[PDB]
Amino acid sequence: IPCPVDTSQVILPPHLEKIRDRLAENIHELWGMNKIELGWTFGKIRDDNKRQHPCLVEFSKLPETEKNYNLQMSTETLKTLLALGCHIAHVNPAAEEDLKKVKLPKNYMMSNGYKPAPLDLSDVKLLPPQEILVDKLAENAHNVWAKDRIKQGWTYGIQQDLKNKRNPRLVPYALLDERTKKSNRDSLREAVRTFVGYGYNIEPSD
Secondary structure, eight states, X not given: OOXXXXXXXXXXXXXXXXXXXXXXXXXXXXXXXXXXXXXXXXXXXXXXXXXXXXXXXXXXXXXXXXXXXXXXXXXXXXXXXXXXXXXXXXXXXXXXXXXXXXXXXXXXXXTTSXXXXXXXXXXXXXXXXXXXXXXXXXXXXHHHHHHHHHTTTOEEOSSOOBTTTEETTOSOGGGSOHHHHHHHHHHHHHHHHHHHHTTOEEEXXX
């Protein structure tokens, strides 16, 4: 059923290692900001009631498993673009000079002193071909997730989720609700926007 893009024999080249790290860093700041907007706060153990999460901290002070997973997700996004035959070029290195973090208001600060500082990408526009790549990355991200769940024994749940291995999101990406598609797209749009903000062109294959 799910056929994600095979990245197993795709190598991340040395020239993309820095932008891979910068993407993982900014995507964490955006994740923390979204959680804090939704009423989440720092706590030492994750609790979905109470809305407390231990990853509401600086990227450098994340626990190593979660820090590695964030770097992995960034590496796999770049490996997917390469595997799709996309053309990545660092056309404007000086775009990093005009690149600033947003200063969030004092109430975005958590009890451990962490406050998100995502990049100000307010002037960074994506053109339609980059938005088409965002849609492809989101569909592929769903297929990667679905393959990983299927390899752990999960099965389609008939409208109803059940923590013994049934999930209703085990459908083709096109059969998801539009809100689900939106949420998945919005994460990867800000990743592609982050690439363009550091002065990269990211163009579809011929």
